[PDB]
Paper text:
The synthesis of two truncated (synthetic) regions of Amblyomin-X, one called the Kunitz domain which corresponds to fragments (1–57) of Amblyomin-X contains the first 6 cysteine residues, the other the C-ter domain which corresponds to fragment 58-106 in which cysteine 67 has been mutated to the Serine residue, as well as the associated peptides, were performed by solid-phase peptide synthesis (SPPS). The X-ray analysis confirms that the first portion of Amblyomin-X (amino acids 1–58) possesses a typical Kunitz structure, with two α-helices and two β-sheets kept together with three disulfide bridges (Cys7-Cys58, Cys33-Cys54, Cys18-Cys41). The diversity between the two loops of these Kunitz domains could suggest a different interaction of [name] with the FXa. This consideration is in agreement with the evidence that [name] showed lower inhibitory activity against FXa than TFPI-K2. In contrast, the N-ter [name] is not capable of crossing through the cell membrane but is associated with tumor cell cytotoxicity when it is microinjected into the cells or fused to TAT cell-penetrating peptide. No microinjection cells were used as control.
Amblyomin-X is a Kunitz-type FXa inhibitor identified through the transcriptome analysis of the salivary gland from [name] tick. This protein consists of two domains of equivalent size, triggers apoptosis in different tumor cell lines, and promotes regression of tumor growth, and reduction of metastasis. As a recombinant protein, Amblyomin-X inhibits Factor Xa (FXa) activity in vitro and presents the anticoagulant property in animal models.
Author numbering: 1 to 58
The structure:
């Protein structure tokens, strides 16, 4: 595996039609950890629930 590689996965906000609560998450864009509205389902690993977790990995 390779946990650092998750840092270049594309931002994926998830499926709007799910019944999950939406939530702030963070993703790495190559120069910064950027906040986005995660739809609470789907997505990929470039998805952090704290800016600190994004910064400590990417």
């Amino acid at each position: 595996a390779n946990s650092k590689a998750v840092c270049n996965l594309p931002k994926l906000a998830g499926d709007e039609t799910c019944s999950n609560k939406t939530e702030i998450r963070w993703y790495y864009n190559g120069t910064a950890c950027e906040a986005f509205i995660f739809k609470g389902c789907g997505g990929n690993d470039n998805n952090f629930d704290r800016v600190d977790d994004c910064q400590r990995l990417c």
